[PDB]
A paper describes a structure:
The first example we chose was the mersacidin decarboxylase (MrsD) cage protein and a protein A domain. MrsD is a homo-oligomeric flavin-containing Cys decarboxylase (HFCD) flavoprotein involved in the biosynthesis of the lantibiotic mersacidin. It forms a large cage-like structure composed of 12 subunits. The C-terminus of MrsD has an alpha helix of 13 amino acid residues. We superimposed 6 amino acids of this helix with the N-terminal helix of the protein A domain. In the superimposed region, MrsD residues were chosen for amino acid positions pointing to the core of MrsD, and residues of protein A were chosen for those pointing to the core of the protein A. The MrsD-protein A fusion protein designed in this way was successfully produced in E. coli as a soluble protein that was resistant to subtilisin digestion and crystallizable. In the crystal structure, the MrsD and protein A modules are connected by a long fused alpha helix. The bending and twist angles of the fused helix are 5.5 and 98.8 degrees, respectively, closely resembling those of the ideal helix used in the design. In comparison, the fusion proteins PKA_RIIα-protein A, MrsD-protein A and DARPin-protein A ligated by the shared helix method have negligible structural flexibility at the fusion sites.
Residue numbers in the entry:
A (entry chain D), D (entry chain D): -3 to 66, 75 to 229
B (entry chain C): 5 to 66, 77 to 154, 168 to 229
C (entry chain B): 7 to 66, 77 to 154, 168 to 229
Amino acid sequence: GGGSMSISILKDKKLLIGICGSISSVGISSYLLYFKSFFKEIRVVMTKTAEDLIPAHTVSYFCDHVYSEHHVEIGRWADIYCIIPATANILGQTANGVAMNLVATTVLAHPHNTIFFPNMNDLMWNKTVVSRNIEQLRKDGHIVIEPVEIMAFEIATGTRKPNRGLITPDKALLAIEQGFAFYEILHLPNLNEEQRNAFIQSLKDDPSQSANLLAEAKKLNDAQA
Amino acid sequence: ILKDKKLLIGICGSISSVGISSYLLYFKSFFKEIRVVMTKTAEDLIPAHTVSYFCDHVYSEHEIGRWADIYCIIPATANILGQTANGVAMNLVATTVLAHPHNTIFFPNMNDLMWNKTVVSRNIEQLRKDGHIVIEPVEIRGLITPDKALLAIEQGFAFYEILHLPNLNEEQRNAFIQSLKDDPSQSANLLAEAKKLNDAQA
Amino acid sequence: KDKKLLIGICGSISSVGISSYLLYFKSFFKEIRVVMTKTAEDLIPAHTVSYFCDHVYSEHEIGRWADIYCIIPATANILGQTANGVAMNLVATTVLAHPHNTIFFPNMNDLMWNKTVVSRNIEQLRKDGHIVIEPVEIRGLITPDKALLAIEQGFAFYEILHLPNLNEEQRNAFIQSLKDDPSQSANLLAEAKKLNDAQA
Amino acid sequence: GGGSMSISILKDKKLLIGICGSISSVGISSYLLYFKSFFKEIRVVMTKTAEDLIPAHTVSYFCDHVYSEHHVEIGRWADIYCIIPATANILGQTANGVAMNLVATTVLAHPHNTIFFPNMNDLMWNKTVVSRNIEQLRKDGHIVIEPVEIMAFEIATGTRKPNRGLITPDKALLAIEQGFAFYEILHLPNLNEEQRNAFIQSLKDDPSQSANLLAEAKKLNDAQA
Ligand SMILES: Cc1cc2nc3c(=O)[nH]c(=O)nc-3n(C[C@H](O)[C@H](O)[C@H](O)COP(=O)(O)OP(=O)(O)OC[C@H]3O[C@@H](n4cnc5c(N)ncnc54)[C@H](O)[C@@H]3O)c2cc1C
Ligand SMILES: Cc1cc2nc3c(=O)[nH]c(=O)nc-3n(C[C@H](O)[C@H](O)[C@H](O)COP(=O)(O)OP(=O)(O)OC[C@H]3O[C@@H](n4cnc5c(N)ncnc54)[C@H](O)[C@@H]3O)c2cc1C
Ligand SMILES: Cc1cc2nc3c(=O)[nH]c(=O)nc-3n(C[C@H](O)[C@H](O)[C@H](O)COP(=O)(O)OP(=O)(O)OC[C@H]3O[C@@H](n4cnc5c(N)ncnc54)[C@H](O)[C@@H]3O)c2cc1C
Ligand SMILES: Cc1cc2nc3c(=O)[nH]c(=O)nc-3n(C[C@H](O)[C@H](O)[C@H](O)COP(=O)(O)OP(=O)(O)OC[C@H]3O[C@@H](n4cnc5c(N)ncnc54)[C@H](O)[C@@H]3O)c2cc1C
């Protein structure tokens, strides 16, 4: 199924997007504008390197507000906290509980969990620490959306090298929907392990079903209070 | 037939400048060398250091007309059209139009409202009467895609080159032009045939 | 006629008194915003002008926000820019970004006013659909009340001239009554719209 | 054997040296100048604290170029990336995949592995986290050259306390040669565990043999393709 199918569950949600210092951040509007018609309100928090690549005044044209590091309530303001693109550095900080910029701090100050969208060249992606930190973030309850292997321009080399890049805005929207349904189903009180793994396994096989799955998981929740 | 030429791209203060990389990278495999000159508003939207990752050099408002073999302004604002159409040159982008030998290819980009303003159409027609080329935008009204932009650049180069062949006559001149306005992907084959009829009639 | 009015201030000494106009316009329009050039800000700070209107746009959207865009006072430079399609400051740009036409209130000394290029730019602006209110010989601005009457008259001019499914008869009938009583603009235009939809 | 014996393998190599905020950085010229006659080209990337101790304009007198934090291609530019002197902080960042300055980022963006030269007083060296991070860097494939116990001036105390200091420029040059031969031999395709451990064990017993060892390990590589 498609991406614009579980729109229901994002209709009233506040989305906070953290932008890190990756060259793909220059194109973040393609994500922002696409998300704009699905959430109640979208705000952005940026690192300094992201601001050096693309100014906060530019990003503000594509969302409701931009938080710059020159704001500790934004983690509670957001219903969904998504970091895209996420650098190896933000993964290292968040996986190790270090919070030196507002994006990494928002991970700790945000109530539930964070959805990361890593983006780096294949060289950095194959470093041991990066994989270790990804797996630590996953074990701590955060969600790390896998990038796709493509041949993109390498800023460093001026030629096309192998790069681990972002999924399209619709596949990202599906990833956010799926992840939200993941956390909500995982933390429903009046359910047992078999029904919970039943709802989770069908989310990993068809994420466009998130709306229908979550909607049914809530009604089996109250029926079993 | 552009692998020999130096391409200079001037960026003006439009939000579409944030996507200029999509053009720069695409052009990179067709021209000998691509450099960029920016306005201050364009730099405020997207820094010159960011653009530099996608080209050979970026000239900021902090010679280049003669360096370029082809000068393309993309995106072009209404203001840059008003300046160039009236011979006013207050930033480096407009000045390069005056300092560049031959003609300039403009890629205007504006909302549908500004495009229908009388002064804007007047300035477009003035630029066209002065020998410059103004590429029409499409409805998606935005800029054409990088592949169509490349075809338009090629077509414009072939236009100016055929129009300024010395020992050729009006009928064959419009003959080479009319087949370019009907098939721009033939620019390589037509221009190559126009030069060999040139020396054959010396 | 509770439309939104945007006023552009150019670098003229008369800008120091722009409040006398703003306040007067404020007593007719419910919402008034101002956009300034840098020179106008050097003469009178934007924070000072902000005491007399709802918001001041500085050089440190608004064309579509405004229903009526009026440049007062307008310098020779702003006339040269707007007449030639050149937009180098926010005031001149708003002329291009505004959906309809602009009302200019030129203010300059008689020397600059009698220069050929200035008259040429005025006539070019008029030929392009913009309205240029004539100054008085003192060459200064008309009083605020007459300025408000001129703004109403100009707005109704453009609105009546562009009625789609209405004919030259009723259109010239609504126009001739505007040149004789501009304070009737609100009553005239309101009657022109209802004859509009009645003749769809 | 001596240090100027395996010069062959550095003749065509580009060396990037990262300087961290240690007082020994004030004397880095003794290393730079000594290395200058052995590599094709030597560039430097500095942290802010290193720049506070010794200005980048001063270091530029002793190498080909100085990268200051006020440059993501330098990791691919370098053939060999060496961090000297390395602070406890740079070890903490690199061991945990955190990249907040250009030196630590270059570790991730550099294609192979990094050779660290730690330098700190004996007090910091005996902290548990420092040893843990050293061992983590070693387990992740990086090389950490051991400092030597001496009695040096303590900036903090104005008297001589025990300090863990750098090896001489020639022993460092040997360490770089040895480490380069280590990685190259470790990643030769057409070799088996017994021949590889044979080449490695003789590198740990005589590093001045690196040139002869690597040269032979390549010719047994192609002979076994
Ligand atoms: C053009 C370019 C593209 C890049 N693309 C990628 C990529 O796709 N993937 C990838 O993994 N890496 C990439 N990097 C490297 C990455 O930017 C560095 O690792 C950087 O240090 C991490 O940036 P960040 O936005 O995650 O955090 P940053 O906020 O950038 O943290 C480091 C930077 O922030 C500033 N800073 C100062 N104090 C602090 C503080 N207390 N907390 C936080 N920041 C501080 C510093 O000036 C420093 O440059 C790129 C670098 C460049 C120059
Ligand atoms: C987000 C945004 C998007 C826009 N998109 C479009 C569009 O698609 N189409 C369109 O026609 N118009 C657009 N405009 C309006 C356009 O930017 C203005 O008309 C502007 O004056 C055009 O500038 P330019 O890039 O043509 O040349 P510029 O060189 O930008 O023209 C002069 C401008 O540059 C700055 N500048 C020049 N020299 C200096 C200096 N020495 N110091 C400081 N500042 C200096 C000034 O602030 C001035 O506004 C847009 C404006 C904005 C804010
Ligand atoms: C005391 C005083 C009295 C005046 N009286 C009159 C009058 O009676 N009538 C009249 O018509 N005018 C008057 N002017 C304005 C003056 O005559 C000029 O015409 C002035 O440049 C008008 O500009 P502006 O008001 O439109 O402001 P703006 O359009 O903002 O003027 C442009 C300003 O930006 C700066 N600038 C320079 N280069 C650039 C660039 N490339 N891009 C952007 N900005 C640039 C300049 O310093 C200049 O002041 C007066 C000015 C002063 C100081
Ligand atoms: C004179 C002196 C000598 C020292 N000698 C030693 C030694 O021999 N061994 C040892 O282990 N420690 C030493 N230290 C302590 C060490 O400098 C600190 O731990 C320091 O924070 C690490 O410096 P660095 O060069 O590794 O990284 P730094 O780049 O120095 O990181 C911290 C410093 O960088 C600046 N900074 C700001 N934002 C960022 C960012 N996003 N990323 C990186 N840096 C940022 C800060 O101003 C801060 O002071 C010494 C300190 C001093 C003052």
